[PDB]
């Protein structure tokens with residue numbers, strides 16, 4: 001997160017920290033969020049050979065009793081996820097066990113331009129800075145779809161256009177998959193933007209994918 005501030009520890013108990021294993025490189029990281037005691041929502045571009053999820057974290061380098069580290073048994077990447085157009089950037093992760101409900105760990109159960117929303121993550125705090133140790137958050141403006149025109153594949157039915165171009169606030173590398181909360185409901189998921197972090201950025205519009213989400217959760 002660029003231009004944000006450190007979150008009050010454990011104030012976003014649905015936040016998931018994802019470590020992504022691939023077979024040919026070192027580990028990568030994404031955010032995500034707990035929608036059911038055994039399901040994490042995140043971005044399809046976070047998929048890999050295997051993933052481990054840490055719940056209950058604030059400072060990701062300092063183990064504490066709030067931590068729940070859980071194995072992912074299956075990844076359900078959206079079947080239409082397209083690496084050319086970048087549409088349908090969404091994935092469910094099924095956890096091996098049900099997470100415990102604690103002060104630090106809970107679910108986040110289930111919109112037009114103008115509204116201020118919040119995003120949170122452990123990602124880079126600058127173009128050339130490392131990922132944050134601690135969970136950071138920022139407030140971002142929802143924009144009219146026109147503000148995202150220069151993303152040629154942007155589609156207002158599937159995606160939200162997020163961040164006032166006059167400000168430097170943005171999600172960045174490592175924040176992928178994290179929720180956009182507007183009035184305490186998750187409305188989007190960090191998807192993509194410019195390499196230089198100049199806003200706005202493109203978030204997956206969660207309402208369009210609700211039938212798909214329900215179908216996976218009911219069959220599992």
Ligand SMILES: CCO/N=C1/CN(C(=O)N[C@H](CC)c2ccc(C(=O)O)cc2)C(=O)[C@H](Cc2cc(Cl)ccc2OC)CN1
Pocket residue numbers: 020028029030045046047086089124131170171172173174175176190191192193194195196197201202
């Ligand atoms: C639809 C496909 O979208 N692809 C990406 C690229 N991307 C990654 O590939 N991230 C991997 C994790 C899967 C990654 C790579 C490097 C690092 C690092 O810290 O170097 C962290 C995570 C990302 O992390 C991007 C982060 C990001 C978010 C926004 Cl909102 C704006 C710009 C931006 O990156 C330049 C998001 N999307």
Ligand SMILES: *[C@@H]1O[C@H](CO)[C@@H](O)[C@H](O)[C@H]1NC(C)=O
Pocket residue numbers: 059060061062133134
């Ligand atoms: C996170 O925890 C580590 C190990 O305790 C500590 O060195 C580091 O300063 C912490 N980072 C913070 C609070 O930003």
Ligand SMILES: *[C@@H]1O[C@H](CO)[C@@H](O)[C@H](O)[C@H]1NC(C)=O
Pocket residue numbers: 082083084085
């Ligand atoms: C991705 O989308 C483009 C345009 O919609 C399409 O031509 C392509 O077949 C889709 N599938 C893949 C596998 O990229």
Ligand SMILES: [Zn+2]
Pocket residue numbers: 009010058064066
């Ligand atoms: Zn704690």
